[PDB]
Amino acid sequence: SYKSVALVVGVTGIVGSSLAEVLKLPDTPGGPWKVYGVARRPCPVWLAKKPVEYIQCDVSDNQETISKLSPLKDITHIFYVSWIGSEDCQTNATMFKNILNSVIPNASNLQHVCLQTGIKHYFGPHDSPFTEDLPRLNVQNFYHDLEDILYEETGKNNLTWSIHRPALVFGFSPCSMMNIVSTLCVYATICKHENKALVYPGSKNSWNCYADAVDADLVAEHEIWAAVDPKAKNQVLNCNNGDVFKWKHIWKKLAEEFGIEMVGYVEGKEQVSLAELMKDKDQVWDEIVKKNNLVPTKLKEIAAFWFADIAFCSENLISSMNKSKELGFLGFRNSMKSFVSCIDKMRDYRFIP
Amino acid sequence: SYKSVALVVGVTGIVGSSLAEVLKLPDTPGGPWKVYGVARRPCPVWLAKKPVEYIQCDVSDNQETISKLSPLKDITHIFYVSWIGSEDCQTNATMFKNILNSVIPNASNLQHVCLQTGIKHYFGPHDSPFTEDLPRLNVQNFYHDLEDILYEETGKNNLTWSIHRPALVFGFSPCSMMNIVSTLCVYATICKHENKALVYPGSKNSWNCYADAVDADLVAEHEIWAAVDPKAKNQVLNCNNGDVFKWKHIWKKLAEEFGIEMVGYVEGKEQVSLAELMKDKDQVWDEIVKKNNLVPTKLKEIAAFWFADIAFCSENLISSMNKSKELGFLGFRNSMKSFVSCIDKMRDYRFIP
Ligand SMILES: NC(=O)c1ccc[n+]([C@@H]2O[C@H](COP(=O)([O-])OP(=O)(O)OC[C@H]3O[C@@H](n4cnc5c(N)ncnc54)[C@H](OP(=O)(O)O)[C@@H]3O)[C@@H](O)[C@H]2O)c1
Ligand SMILES: NC(=O)c1ccc[n+]([C@@H]2O[C@H](COP(=O)([O-])OP(=O)(O)OC[C@H]3O[C@@H](n4cnc5c(N)ncnc54)[C@H](OP(=O)(O)O)[C@@H]3O)[C@@H](O)[C@H]2O)c1
């Protein structure tokens, strides 16, 4: 009953969860899609609401991965949208290897492997706007190892490949290790709960510089596009919303969305660590979860305040989308509207109040 | 034999000359187009090579404009892509008024008026990225007067309107008062002629900041789009290539295109005036024109070194293209390729060697 069969590795992820939604849409290219969804944790109740076949599997475990993925003979497309959570090149490589060694010898109709890395490929720095043809930096980066494995395995087995390097992701998953919007929404939620203004903790430059990002749905569209369009086969491809923004403008919108007052960047002041400010807010979040009858999340799991700290001390990281556009991909998002869209969606899904 | 009849006011201009080419293409929306081309100077020999009906007319002269434009009964679309060359609000307004008072009472099939202004509407400043809904600055700007005239005249006479605010234009016209690419090509040409490196004269920030621009052909496409598409009627619309660049990268490409060595921005050094450096190069340019058998241009007419000086002390002027994209306009250009395209085209047309 299916035309294509997808293996989404990291289905609970910030992009994986989007693929779980987009792939199942009736007019999605390559459809109708059958979707295998792989993650380490037991299937979340909110993901059980989706028509995907969830496979709980520790992908870093070769024998377990072989055991659970080798019976899947009908897979045609692999979407690797995971990482182990550390910068370890070897343990990250093992995960991707295990996926490949378990599926390739068992899926006689396998066609394409989508590999998701990121713009960190460009600065670990190269100057921006980042273009896909920029050579690797002379450092260790697990993105490098993943690429080399991709080239080696797809070539020997007559498979097409695509490398996707998304910018900062605007998404809705509460299970992501790096979800900036959920992180800021939690921070805003705690501020309103304690009757405090939304105080910008970041640096001056990050407040005022041009920044870019990518909607999680657009990444999914981009990866599906490369999975079905011949023009995008065997290509390295950046992926962002196609525009630029400033955190100063996002911050104001975030404050309005939560109906609280805002304290923007103050001249002379240095950046403060959000990870430190929120260090002891675990019980407060538990109270908010209960009172608002939200989907039960741990503060540590829905928010990554350390990740916001890095974003708020970064600049000059704009990536170019010209290559994808010249290849025919005309997908885009208004980044300001995308950010608001993610807030509404996480409220919708009762991840945040 | 024509479906639409265009009045291009400023046909020798950096955008007007592009309209003269694009409108006459067979698959251009609204085609086949008849094109009236209006400018003050006698018709250039290179413009006589185009199938447009040239009308030499001083548009600031009401009686002359009435005399030459009132017999044109068949006009359906007006493309105002001119200005007088000064910031004078009244003399600029008179030009636009004279066009309207001469055509509207005489063109019974008039439908739409395209008004081209620019991003100067946003800083004369507002913060960027500039969006079309930003209110007018509390200053005198002839863009304001042109808009008010547009609203007033189109409303009373049941006409649709469109306001186009292009970014810095990458074009090919040698008759433009503000052509940055021709200006830099002339500078590069003189450098190679005097056996000197392409020394960057601008500021540090302009060398290193994100910048945007718009291809002259894309502006034409954008204005034609608004002229034929209902979704774009009665809208204020930005127009850029849809990406960003840095002058540091453009400068390197410019040096390669002319086969000469480059001296980029040097730390500690202040900006130098190009208008001063090139002040006495008129005869040198005449020599280059003769030796290379180029189309006869005066240094003052093909180059605007004062304009490059302003561009090389500017920053934070990025404009947003989201509105046009959300309205269905998916036209774009790779700015780096667009810049190279303009160089090749001016060499093609023998404006530069
Ligand atoms: N997030 C961003 O903003 C962003 C932006 C640009 C690029 N990237 C890059 O995109 C890539 C994908 O990261 P992401 O941010 O999409 O990840 P994410 O949202 O944090 O999700 C990671 C997914 O991988 C799964 N996973 C982790 N370890 C596993 C294991 N041992 N076995 C099975 N599944 C495992 C997780 O499930 P469990 O939770 O059950 O383990 C989760 O579903 C990364 O390389 C990242 O650097 C991310
Ligand atoms: N150039 C850019 O980079 C740029 C970027 C953004 C916005 N803009 C804006 O776009 C608008 C159009 O300017 P542009 O740069 O396209 O102009 P341009 O390339 O300098 O050409 C101006 C045109 O207007 C004609 N003109 C001037 N005075 C006239 C008169 N009295 N009677 C008849 N024709 C006359 C000129 O013909 P003659 O030479 O024969 O007089 C010329 O064809 C301006 O408001 C400008 O601010 C320009």
Swiss-Prot record, chains A, B:
<comment type="subunit">
    <text>Homodimer.</text>
</comment>
<feature type="binding site">
    <location>
        <position position="169"/>
    </location>
    <ligand>
        <name>NADP(+)</name>
    </ligand>
</feature>
<feature type="binding site">
    <location>
        <position position="116"/>
    </location>
    <ligand>
        <name>NADP(+)</name>
    </ligand>
</feature>
<dbReference type="GO" id="GO:0005829">
    <property type="term" value="C:cytosol"/>
</dbReference>
<feature type="binding site">
    <location>
        <begin position="176"/>
        <end position="178"/>
    </location>
    <ligand>
        <name>NADP(+)</name>
    </ligand>
</feature>
<protein>
    <recommendedName>
        <fullName>(S)-8-oxocitronellyl enol synthase</fullName>
        <ecNumber>1.3.1.122</ecNumber>
    </recommendedName>
</protein>
<dbReference type="GO" id="GO:0016628">
    <property type="term" value="F:oxidoreductase activity, acting on the CH-CH group of donors, NAD or NADP as acceptor"/>
</dbReference>
<feature type="binding site">
    <location>
        <begin position="82"/>
        <end position="83"/>
    </location>
    <ligand>
        <name>NADP(+)</name>
    </ligand>
</feature>
<keyword id="KW-0521">NADP</keyword>
<feature type="binding site">
    <location>
        <position position="120"/>
    </location>
    <ligand>
        <name>substrate</name>
    </ligand>
</feature>
<feature type="binding site">
    <location>
        <begin position="58"/>
        <end position="59"/>
    </location>
    <ligand>
        <name>NADP(+)</name>
    </ligand>
</feature>
<dbReference type="Pfam" id="PF22917">
    <property type="entry name" value="PRISE"/>
</dbReference>
<keyword id="KW-0963">Cytoplasm</keyword>
<feature type="binding site">
    <location>
        <begin position="40"/>
        <end position="41"/>
    </location>
    <ligand>
        <name>NADP(+)</name>
    </ligand>
</feature>
<dbReference type="InterPro" id="IPR055222">
    <property type="entry name" value="PRISE-like_Rossmann-fold"/>
</dbReference>
<dbReference type="GO" id="GO:0042802">
    <property type="term" value="F:identical protein binding"/>
</dbReference>
<dbReference type="InterPro" id="IPR036291">
    <property type="entry name" value="NAD(P)-bd_dom_sf"/>
</dbReference>
<dbReference type="GO" id="GO:0042803">
    <property type="term" value="F:protein homodimerization activity"/>
</dbReference>
<feature type="binding site">
    <location>
        <position position="143"/>
    </location>
    <ligand>
        <name>NADP(+)</name>
    </ligand>
</feature>
<feature type="binding site">
    <location>
        <position position="314"/>
    </location>
    <ligand>
        <name>substrate</name>
    </ligand>
</feature>
<keyword id="KW-0560">Oxidoreductase</keyword>
<feature type="active site">
    <location>
        <position position="120"/>
    </location>
</feature>
<feature type="binding site">
    <location>
        <begin position="12"/>
        <end position="14"/>
    </location>
    <ligand>
        <name>NADP(+)</name>
    </ligand>
</feature>
<dbReference type="GO" id="GO:0016099">
    <property type="term" value="P:monoterpenoid biosynthetic process"/>
</dbReference>
<keyword id="KW-0520">NAD</keyword>
<comment type="similarity">
    <text>Belongs to the short-chain dehydrogenases/reductases (SDR) family. Highly divergent.</text>
</comment>
<feature type="active site">
    <location>
        <position position="143"/>
    </location>
</feature>
<feature type="binding site">
    <location>
        <position position="143"/>
    </location>
    <ligand>
        <name>substrate</name>
    </ligand>
</feature>
<comment type="function">
    <text>Iridoid synthase that catalyzes the first step in generation of the iridoid ring scaffold using the linear monoterpene (6E)-8-oxogeranial as substrate. Iridoids comprise a large family of distinctive bicyclic monoterpenes that possess a wide range of pharmacological activities, including anticancer, anti-inflammatory, antifungal and antibacterial activities.</text>
</comment>
